[PDB]
Amino acid sequence: GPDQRAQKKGDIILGGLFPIHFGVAAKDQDLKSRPESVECIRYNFRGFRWLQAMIFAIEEINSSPALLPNLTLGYRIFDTCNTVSKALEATLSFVAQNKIDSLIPSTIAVVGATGSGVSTAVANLLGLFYIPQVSYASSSRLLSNKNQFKSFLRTIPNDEHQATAMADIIEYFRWNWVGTIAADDDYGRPGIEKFREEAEERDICIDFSELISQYSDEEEIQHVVEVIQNSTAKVIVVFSSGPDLEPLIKEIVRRNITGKIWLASEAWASSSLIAMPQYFHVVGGTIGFALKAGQIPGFREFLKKVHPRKSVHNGFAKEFWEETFNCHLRPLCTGDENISSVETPYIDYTHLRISYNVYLAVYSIAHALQDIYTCLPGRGLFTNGSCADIKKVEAWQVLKHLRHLNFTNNMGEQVTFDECGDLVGNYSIINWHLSPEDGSIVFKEVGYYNVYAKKGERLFINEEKILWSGFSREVPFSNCSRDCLAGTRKGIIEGEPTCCFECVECPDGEYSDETDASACNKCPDDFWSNENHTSCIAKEIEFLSWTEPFGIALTLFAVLGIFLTAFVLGVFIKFRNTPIVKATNRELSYLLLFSLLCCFSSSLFFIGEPQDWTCRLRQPAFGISFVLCISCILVKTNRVLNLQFLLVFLCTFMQIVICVIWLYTAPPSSYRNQELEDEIIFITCHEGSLMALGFLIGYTCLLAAICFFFAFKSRKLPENFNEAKFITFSMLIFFIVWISFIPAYASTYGKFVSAVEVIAILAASFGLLACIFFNKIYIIL
Amino acid sequence: GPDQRAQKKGDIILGGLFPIHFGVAAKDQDLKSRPESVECIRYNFRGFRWLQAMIFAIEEINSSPALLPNLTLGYRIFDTCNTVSKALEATLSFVAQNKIDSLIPSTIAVVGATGSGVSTAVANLLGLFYIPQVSYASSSRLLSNKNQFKSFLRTIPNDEHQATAMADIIEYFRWNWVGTIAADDDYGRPGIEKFREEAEERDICIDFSELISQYSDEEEIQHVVEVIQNSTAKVIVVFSSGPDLEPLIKEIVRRNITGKIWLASEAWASSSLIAMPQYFHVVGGTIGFALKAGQIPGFREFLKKVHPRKSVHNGFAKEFWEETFNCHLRPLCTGDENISSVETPYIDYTHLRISYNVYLAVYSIAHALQDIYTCLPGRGLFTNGSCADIKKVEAWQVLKHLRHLNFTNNMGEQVTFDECGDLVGNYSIINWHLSPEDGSIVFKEVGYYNVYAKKGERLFINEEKILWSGFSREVPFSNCSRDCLAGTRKGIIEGEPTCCFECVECPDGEYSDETDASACNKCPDDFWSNENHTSCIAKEIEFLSWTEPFGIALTLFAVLGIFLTAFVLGVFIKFRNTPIVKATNRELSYLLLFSLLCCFSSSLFFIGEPQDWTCRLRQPAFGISFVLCISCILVKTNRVLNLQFLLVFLCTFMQIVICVIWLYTAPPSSYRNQELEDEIIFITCHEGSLMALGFLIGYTCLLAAICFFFAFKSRKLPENFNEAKFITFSMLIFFIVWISFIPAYASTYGKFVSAVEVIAILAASFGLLACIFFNKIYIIL
């Protein structure tokens, strides 16, 4: 394998894969000459701390007599540089003894790798030989496939819960308009696809989806940046590692794009490549996920005990020293430098999260080996309950014991893998703040995600600790469209997602009292829409009311007419013996005055709220009363020109025959017209039989015409103080009144028609009463 | 490597990876004993034909002295069983000489593999050693990444064009409501993601997205089947291979789900696992993609020459013979069996598509080796133009020459790889029909996809050759909602994609003349929507027209009044010497008759379409004329009770002053009311100054009342044939006819108000003319 390595000799050997470098020298191999090994460039102190965690765990296990007594653990650890090719060279180094036996110490298990693509490439080769591989950082769901990867286990949780938690965080702050950026690898794509599913189930619309890489060209990065600029969405879900996101962040910083809310996956939410003060105007206020911190007592002292000369087994200490103090062993360095003097991620960490995963992977392998070592002969997991010989143990036996592993931590937590080889765990939710004292980016814990909880209760966030964009205390707005107010409704914008809608006000008569209403609700039959359609109010009912001032005036005039009729009748009764009262027919005068009273009472019927019987008794009453009065006048004229009572009764009987017939066949009824005006319901009467009203008015007018003619023939005659002329005047007044109001008798419905009717009745009755009796009263004085 | 193999010795050795079996035995070991090599189970005749294509191409290259003279090509071909593990054992066999030199013949290049995941796993290891690998079937876009895969090339096109073509096919048949099923591997997921991007670009909504595998459990297959059943989408885009889709198709056949329109990716559009007659009630009428067929002359004879004993280099011939004739060497078989007698995919093919790809991969390697062999010393591709020694050639040199390869086919087509190592090519579009003679599934070509064309013109389909669901000539319906007709618009269904909309009819006064109208267009100011709301028509304009029968009657009465006035005037003029004409003032009689003519002419003004000047000259004309006539009557009464002309001129001067004043300050103007009724515009007049009309009517009525009183004081006087009584009658007629029509003078606008106005004017004028002149005419007779 590669010359630079960390090796210790032992009975049982653990392989190790760590990213001591962030990547390799990015250059296209010309193939002009023999291609030499690609060089790793940028030093990764956090990865070196992870390697030190593996070495520390192995040394701790060796020193403890409790775990694996009389057996020494060795390691062979190589640098992957986050690259598949280096990892595969190291893995070929791991499987040499198996390759010899398929077509150098034996490797019983491997710790690593970090990246999911690297782990997948390694796991193909390792599961070929059934060598167990416990990864500390690779969290792709693709590695949960136990058909493809027979010997892969994880001390890190799967990525599915992280994508679901990202969706839950988006839902918590009431966002539905977000963007997605993913690394174009086995980490980014599966996570972003799970997020897309969990967002579409939550009615969250994703504006854009882009893929990036550390090897993305200038044109591709420009395209992604310009896609971000053209978007209105300010919440961008980025599911990537640090190296894969660094070119995009650098370009966005160079363009000074601000105001975006970055939701970070665990792989970069704590990355020193991205969390730099000079990027804070772009990436400040990032909300991201972190793993559960763990404690390794004595680990920091072990880290501080590093030295090029003293660490002979660890061959990566030389470059660590050279890159720490910027020395060579560029000024020469003695080796007396102090680790505590330099600001690097090596010692200057707050929580051990992936380091604890490395520690747990080593201890899981150690506990599987201990379970092999302490196997009682008849209680084994193998054929017939047999147990493996720890002196001649094979990798598949360790894998079998790992699939059944269940051991207690140093922290008192049960570590066990499921069928998919996954270790479930909580998430912490962190926010990127700026340190006032130091100016560096500080990761403040603002919440957690409890994967052990039932759906809907897993997410907890304390928003008072969140500073949006690094400085703001107001939750930002990340919806495509503003909500549609009450009084409006949503309308579709063609070619755009459901989240993007236009606001269209409700039509007349339809109310929408809910903000963001899909459609405008219609109002019931008797209601009409509010002014702004934010509610609707009952329709106003319209008729001729008693309390109304106009109705009051009409009722006042009706009662005045009744008073005048009663006054005339009383004058006639008290002074009937006078020759003037004797000259005219006293009985017929009484009957005429009673008829006038009935006519005024019938005029009172039209006023008021219509009812079925009221509409039944308005026209018949007036018709009968007026025919009665006209008949009394007619018989008085016939006297002027016993039997008189016969004629008046005949005419009134005819009229009541019409009235009874058309009340029996088709009675008038009150109906509430809603077609005249939308806002107002006009409560009016329905005739039932129009030809019946025709017969009513025709008979009344025919008797009127007969009396008119008979009085006209003898108008000059001076009998009863020329009563014939006054009778003609009264009849002609009746005709004037009922001719005058012809246009208003129909069409103009509502209170106007009833008002015109009662006014016509009052005018006709007053004219008749005056022309008949005012001259006689004047004579009496 | 594996014992079962195809090896031939030679100077330059080609590796080979083929799926001689469809998969591996379902032996999931509990790891109780040492795990033995997993065995492959279902024989794959098409894969054996592909292997034979490789061997045949090598044999022609060896036999032909034109290509690679004096150099013999050897092969080492292993079976992958579509499995990463077997392919990696074979690839470790390929890289043994490099592994010895990194920590058995040398392999200069490898042909394979079929699956994209298998090819990816192989390519990691091969590009580690810079060994070129030319795949014949793996089409994942992930393999185009030349950072991850340094030595991978393809004789098969990429999958991006096929996903775009799937989207174009969906667009062509006007579908927006489709489902997606993908294999959960490096083939299915990238293809389905590209399809999702191209579909969302085209506003196609995807109802469901499911992932399947040959190892999918019963519960997962049940979930996918029930998701398909709950969906209304009938077009399902499936981007998978045969083995990965077989369990789902079997389950769907068991439930007998029909009516689905399967869009097939190339990997299964020609698969014998899926294209089975017993599945045709489910998968009949499938529309899928095929590669471009190629011709290999003499290949079929070579296939027919297969024999267990004769084919000593090909070790897969034994199992091919045993599976073909169901014998062993289960009855014993001599070996005299005839290949042509058995119906297998081996000989019974129609087109060579992947076989031609295998042939082209072998010839691409051969032409790269020829370019190395014929390199002129100063024109090489290596350092300083140097050339590689073909006797001591290395794999990286062959890879370098492959990246620059450009050679002519046996069919006269240029084969060259781009920077990504891709070989672009056309697609054919095929439909799954049932054979009437045989009952097997027949792949009929129904179109093509020309990737060399510009976007929008790549797809060609002849729908006449397509039988939907295998038997139907009608394009099926795959939209979420029916289109919204003209007179309707679209409305949002909450929680659902844009493709799923409700149809809501347009509001009153709004029209949508387009199907699938997003919103209802409002109509212009003078238009209103029809009952269907499919368009809107001009509003009816309403006034009192001359042509109208009622207007005709009014004009007839006006002209009759003018005729009567002219008749009276002529009688007076011709017979002025008679004592009755001399008794009344002849000059004042002429002036009064002229005033009556002016009044009738003013009554003519109200009739007709209103205009600014017409509304200016309706009321003033009547007012002035009526003041003329009233003043003439008044001075004639004053005679009854020079200066007469002075008094009439004074009154008419007051009238003309008021008219001039209110015409100068605020003239009446024609206005088009739209607030009375939505459907109808009412063209009427606007007074301008209401108090001006009040003063006008007040002055007219005041002069009228003065004349009334003066005539009442001398009503009994017998002068001029009791003319004072008739003057009182005329003035009373004026008052009553103007009182009678009071309610109609306002509110009831439109033609009704003008009609009532002209009727009032005619009634007043007729009454005045009659009461003045009819007595004198009767005396004259």
Ligand SMILES: *[C@@H]1O[C@H](CO)[C@@H](O[C@@H]2O[C@H](CO)[C@@H](O)[C@H](O)[C@H]2NC(C)=O)[C@H](O)[C@H]1NC(C)=O
């Ligand atoms: C952004 O859009 C979302 C989804 O439409 C809004 O969330 C809904 O808001 C309404 C009214 O506040 C609630 O009745 C719903 O229950 C919410 N749905 C959820 C939370 O899933 C959110 O209010 C919008 N934010 C804005 C407009 O600032």
Ligand SMILES: *[C@@H]1O[C@H](CO)[C@@H](O[C@@H]2O[C@H](CO)[C@@H](O)[C@H](O)[C@H]2NC(C)=O)[C@H](O)[C@H]1NC(C)=O
């Ligand atoms: C995951 O997080 C939850 C919530 O923080 C943890 O549940 C808490 O457990 C402590 C005891 O250690 C209780 O005092 C709290 O009341 C619990 N909070 C809840 C239930 O909301 C849970 O223990 C965590 N799991 C792991 C493995 O760390």
Ligand SMILES: *[C@@H]1O[C@H](CO)[C@@H](O[C@@H]2O[C@H](CO)[C@@H](O)[C@H](O)[C@H]2NC(C)=O)[C@H](O)[C@H]1NC(C)=O
């Ligand atoms: C299914 O829905 C699609 C939506 O695109 C319809 O296609 C549109 O149809 C309208 C008809 O007025 C055309 O104007 C558009 O140009 C079409 N667009 C596309 C992209 O094709 C399609 O007609 C619908 N099919 C039905 C209802 O059977």
Ligand SMILES: *[C@@H]1O[C@H](CO)[C@@H](O[C@@H]2O[C@H](CO)[C@@H](O)[C@H](O)[C@H]2NC(C)=O)[C@H](O)[C@H]1NC(C)=O
């Ligand atoms: C891809 O398909 C197109 C269309 O079928 C091919 O273009 C045709 O080329 C032939 C000549 O070989 C012409 O006769 C046709 O008229 C062309 N059809 C067109 C332009 O629509 C094209 O040659 C094919 N390319 C390959 C590499 O097969």
Ligand SMILES: CC(C)CCC[C@@H](C)[C@H]1CC[C@H]2[C@@H]3CC=C4C[C@@H](O)CC[C@]4(C)[C@H]3CC[C@]12C
């Ligand atoms: C209701 C109106 C519109 C239509 C019916 C009008 C009829 C009934 C009225 C209106 C005018 C009335 C006429 C007025 C004048 C006279 C002349 C007199 O010597 C006999 C009666 C007679 C002939 C009246 C008969 C009835 C009459 C014709």
Ligand SMILES: CC(C)CCC[C@@H](C)[C@H]1CC[C@H]2[C@@H]3CC=C4C[C@@H](O)CC[C@]4(C)[C@H]3CC[C@]12C
């Ligand atoms: C329009 C309706 C409601 C009211 C009409 C009022 C009518 C009916 C009343 C009011 C004034 C009355 C007139 C007063 C004076 C006279 C003069 C006399 O020699 C004949 C009767 C006559 C002509 C009366 C006829 C009827 C009359 C015109």
Ligand SMILES: CC(C)CCC[C@@H](C)[C@H]1CC[C@H]2[C@@H]3CC=C4C[C@@H](O)CC[C@]4(C)[C@H]3CC[C@]12C
């Ligand atoms: C009864 C006698 C003494 C007088 C008759 C006067 C008559 C002819 C006139 C004078 C005032 C007029 C009213 C004035 C106001 C209105 C309100 C309108 O929306 C309906 C018509 C109505 C109700 C009119 C009816 C007819 C009316 C009452």
Ligand SMILES: CC(C)CCC[C@@H](C)[C@H]1CC[C@H]2[C@@H]3CC=C4C[C@@H](O)CC[C@]4(C)[C@H]3CC[C@]12C
């Ligand atoms: C229609 C409504 C307004 C009622 C109108 C009442 C009018 C028309 C009636 C009631 C009293 C009547 C008057 C009663 C007394 C006389 C005196 C007589 O020598 C001439 C007729 C004359 C002057 C009558 C004219 C008409 C008259 C005024």
Ligand SMILES: CC(C)CCC[C@@H](C)[C@H]1CC[C@H]2[C@@H]3CC=C4C[C@@H](O)CC[C@]4(C)[C@H]3CC[C@]12C
């Ligand atoms: C403007 C609208 C409301 C019409 C107004 C009607 C007025 C102006 C009319 C109608 C009835 C008329 C009155 C009828 C009766 C008489 C009594 C007589 O001895 C003098 C004239 C006099 C007093 C008239 C004056 C004018 C008069 C009051």
Ligand SMILES: CC(C)CCC[C@@H](C)[C@H]1CC[C@H]2[C@@H]3CC=C4C[C@@H](O)CC[C@]4(C)[C@H]3CC[C@]12C
């Ligand atoms: C409502 C309008 C349009 C028409 C009204 C009809 C008027 C104008 C006409 C028609 C019949 C006429 C009446 C006919 C008979 C008489 C009796 C006489 O001794 C006094 C005049 C008097 C009372 C007339 C008054 C005016 C009169 C009522």
Ligand SMILES: CC(C)CCC[C@@H](C)[C@H]1CC[C@H]2[C@@H]3CC=C4C[C@@H](O)CC[C@]4(C)[C@H]3CC[C@]12C
């Ligand atoms: C002068 C002569 C004609 C007598 C006058 C008769 C008057 C009082 C009556 C008889 C018939 C009536 C008309 C009948 C029809 C209508 C149509 C209606 O939508 C408006 C009112 C209107 C236009 C009426 C106006 C008044 C009217 C003309």
Ligand SMILES: CC(C)CCC[C@@H](C)[C@H]1CC[C@H]2[C@@H]3CC=C4C[C@@H](O)CC[C@]4(C)[C@H]3CC[C@]12C
């Ligand atoms: C305005 C519409 C209704 C026309 C009204 C015409 C009426 C009111 C006028 C026109 C002609 C007039 C008649 C002309 C002649 C005479 C004869 C005289 O000895 C008595 C009056 C009497 C009978 C008049 C009564 C009223 C009268 C009928």
Ligand SMILES: O=C(O)[C@@H]1Cc2c([nH]c3ccccc23)CN1
């Ligand atoms: O699976 C993967 O690729 C990522 C790699 C990764 C995770 N967390 C990290 C922290 C630092 C560096 C790398 C990582 C989570 N899993």
Ligand SMILES: O=C(O)[C@@H]1Cc2c([nH]c3ccccc23)CN1
């Ligand atoms: O990349 C892949 O996985 C698929 C495999 C494949 C294709 N076409 C085929 C025909 C038969 C068998 C397998 C295949 C296209 N590429």
Ligand SMILES: *[C@@H]1O[C@H](CO)[C@@H](O)[C@H](O)[C@H]1NC(C)=O
């Ligand atoms: C692991 O052991 C603990 C007790 O030591 C037990 O509670 C737990 O159920 C065990 N886990 C499994 C998966 O059996």
Ligand SMILES: *[C@@H]1O[C@H](CO)[C@@H](O)[C@H](O)[C@H]1NC(C)=O
């Ligand atoms: C390949 O060679 C042919 C000559 O047969 C030439 O026409 C063609 O342009 C060449 N292709 C490239 C990409 O140079």
